[PDB]
Design a protein around this ligand. Structure first.
Ligand code: HSM
Length: 282
């Protein structure tokens, strides 16, 4: 490819990485500064922001020279990049699932949710469990499958050669999170709908709630399904390892776009966090 086009692509991808860094940095700054954001939802938002921020800082910036400018990762560097990227992505997915579970509990057991005493230790335990499971899904397999890789230098995970490992990983990182999020969102909507001139206002508010939940679920699914399905299909047809097509690269970038989108949906739509941002920037 021409040097000018490569430079332009590098600039755009660096802009994407900078945006990913900046949104989550703002979220973390709000959490650290306000000190009125010590609720469970705020801690989960902080976890998600940390995950997406370190997606912005490590994964994408390492990606640009490797792909656009032909820098050759070292084997250990490739292992580090793969492990960190998969860990961060799965951690983002699991943080979204945990946020959905928290909102479902707040809407279904509001009395117990309000009266319940939750210490910082339990919230930290939930966050650490999210991270631990995120690692357990991918890393123990990436490190083990590094041996399976051929002599030729390829920085995809080794288990990409086996389609069933891909199927299991996608089941534990995409399918179950999607099902859980859909269940929680549908239950929140059902809660409001059961609770529901006056009828017209109730209909409008129910429509708004449905639209919001559908937007969340659809964004998550649209971002995470393309690449997973592409990888599974290609591995089943043995095309997972080898040259990549343009659509494959777009699907690859969709997950990082999800990492970019998460800050503006879950944190930025919360009134407490909006107040924090307004105070900070004013
Ligand atoms: N979740 C596997 C790593 C990845 C895919 N797309 C972007 N990063």
């Amino acid at each position: 490819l021409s040097l000018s086009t490569r430079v332009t692509l590098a600039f755009f991808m660096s802009l994407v990485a900078f945006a990913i860094m900046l949104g989550n940095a703002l979220v973390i700054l709000a959490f650290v500064v306000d000190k009125n954001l010590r609720h469970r939802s705020s801690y989960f938002f902080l976890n998600l922001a940390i995950s997406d921020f370190f997606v912005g800082v490590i994964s994408i910036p390492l990606y640009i020279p490797h792909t656009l400018f032909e820098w050759d990762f070292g084997k250990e560097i490739c292992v580090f990049w793969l492990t960190t990227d998969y860990l961060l992505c799965t951690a983002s997915v699991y943080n979204i699932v945990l946020i959905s579970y928290d909102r479902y509990l707040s809407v279904s057991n509001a009395v117990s949710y309000r009266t319940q005493h939750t210490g910082v230790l339990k919230i930290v335990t939930l966050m650490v469990a999210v991270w631990v499971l995120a690692f357990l899904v991918n890393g123990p397999m990436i490190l083990v499958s590094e041996s399976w890789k051929d002599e030729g230098s390829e920085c995809e995970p080794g288990f990409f050669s086996e389609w069933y490992i891909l199927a299991i990983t996608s089941f534990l990182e995409f399918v179950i999170p999607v099902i859980l999020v859909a269940y929680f969102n549908m239950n929140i909507y059902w809660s409001l709908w059961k609770r529901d001139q006056r009828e017209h206002v109730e209909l409008l508010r129910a429509r708004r709630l449905a639209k919001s939940l559908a937007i969340l679920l659809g964004v998550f699914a649209v971002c995470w399904a393309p690449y997973s399905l592409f990888t599974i299909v290609l591995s089943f047809y043995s095309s997972a390892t080898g040259p990549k097509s343009v659509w494959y690269r777009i699907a690859f970038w969709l997950q990082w776009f999800n990492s970019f989108v998460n800050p503006l949906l879950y944190p930025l739509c919360h009134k407490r966090f909006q107040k924090a941002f307004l105070k900070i920037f004013c």
